[model samples]
Target: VNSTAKDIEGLESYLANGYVEANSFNDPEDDALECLSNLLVKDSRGGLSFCKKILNSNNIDGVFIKGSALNFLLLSEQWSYAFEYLTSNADNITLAELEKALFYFYCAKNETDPYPVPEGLFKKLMKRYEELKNDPDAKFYHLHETYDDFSKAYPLNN
Candidate 1:
């Protein structure tokens, strides 16, 4: 259950403790590495746990995997989890990545809420972001633009 040049060490963790799409292996990008770090994390609760493993592992690339995991949580509307991720992992993040990460979740402009969350949950997540916007080093503007555009285009009134 491995993909890419490395062992896909996170695959077993997501399968055992997180979530697996009914036939995720068949996905266009399916591979053990993609499955553990990208697919499940993006598509299921398994993402949170999956990222932790990759972040701790020596085989995988940290910047892309960890940053993207942080991005995935927001895209999946798992914002509370995203904030939890941010609190510990912000040092590993870059503004360029933050922009790219946010772009994927917000640019869709779907008919439905792209990043839907309950109002309470939404605020819980927003609280951290609101704080980050003031961080001197973070080009929080990238974050601001995506979310501001996303919310306006697809309001989370629900």
Candidate 2:
């Protein structure tokens, strides 16, 4: 059976089973190492290409891939693209939470746009973010850091 997947869950499964293989010549650890390294590249073109293909496929290889791209989008200050992707991927917990976070911060930045979520939901997301920031073990911790850096770099008035 093929080990590569498009969605986050399936990718993790491949990671857990020690069956990761993006290319035939690379071994397990080497495979993931390369994948991770590829994702770490700062330029949009590098990781973004993998993310674009992985997500557009509607197939099974994301999460790790997704986060890497999302991190780049946010940190690169490509707010428009970040919001677009998040909106398109709505209902996904990670995307949803980050979207809500972006909305909150955007408003705070004095960029008046319609509130993206209910006030209660925004409050809940704030609370969720507070908790996640402190928990290094959180699944979306790195992405949260990406958001954290972006938000601080461009904070709200209040």
Candidate 3:
């Protein structure tokens, strides 16, 4: 969350100082993953390379894992390649489980097409969003606006 620079040196300062409490990490590459994910949802195609860089970087972990790999795996039709990268990692959750949950969450918040998610996944994501909705430490306006905008943009077809 420091500078816009994409070099490791900029991130090293924050990492050395243990500044992980910030909203966005100092790692520009990982930050790009989040940006690329949002751009992808906005139906842009230019950020795929940046997203791939983030996913392949050794510095990525935790939430970045979900933001980059999970979203790509869920939303992309080229799921085989997505799964290859996702499954190779020694993450705790399976790719399918993560995809299912993420898909439902995105569908609940966005997506104009018929929601392809199963009932159980939809329920789980709805409950999770509800639980986090009232969190005091969470950024309310951004999350609210994101959900609202997505809902407006991608109304349920059926």
Candidate 4:
């Protein structure tokens, strides 16, 4: 097969298995994307560059790749980059995805980082929580319960 097809297959494999084999392809962009996902799991700084690269590319799923990049940035405590990405991509993200990202952002701020979460960011997160809580979809109805469990464990003041 051609390199184009090979690249897509490599990324698809990584998405399926959540990891990539070593030296699987010859300079395929998919290989680099897989590396980004792996390094994100390991919380490595090297993966951040790959995140930027993949997010800027046109060959892949936008929301999925953005979510992956956001996940890595939050986990690695790249607060500025994560928040900036969230803000810039807000229009492209679904409410459920936004809620999830905000939830993790809050966790990183409270549990991972030593700094205080800014009031503005906290308010934006809470607004998403409110929206999700009111959603008619049963899939999101359980978020209230999870938030209750979270709040009891770590109370976040407004």
TM-score against truth, every candidate: 0.41, 0.40, 0.37, 0.51
Model 1 misplaced regions, further than 4 Å? 1-5, 9-49, 52-64, 72-116, 154-158
The digit string of per-residue lDDT tens for model 2 on 32-72 reads: 43554444353336445444444454443333444544545
Q: For model 3, what is the alpha-carbon lDDT of residue 154?
A: 44
**lDDT of model 2, residue 27:** 54
lDDT of 3 by residue, 67-152 (tens): 55455654666454444553444243333234343443555454466434333433443344455555553342244444444445
Name the candidate that leads on lDDT: 4
- For candidate 3, what's the RMSD? 9.1
Q: Note the Cα lDDT for every prediction shown.
A: 0.49, 0.46, 0.44, 0.54
Candidate 3 lDDT (Cα, 0 to 1): 0.44
Clash total of candidate 2 = 8
| Model 3, runs deviating above 4 Å | 1-62, 78-115, 149-158
Poorest 10 consecutive residues by lDDT, candidate 3: 1-10
What is the TM-score of candidate 2?
0.40
Better of 2 and 3 by TM-score: 2
Ranking by TM-score: 4, 1, 2, 3
Clashing pairs in 2: 5-60, 5-61, 6-60, 6-61, 6-62, 7-60, 7-61, 108-156
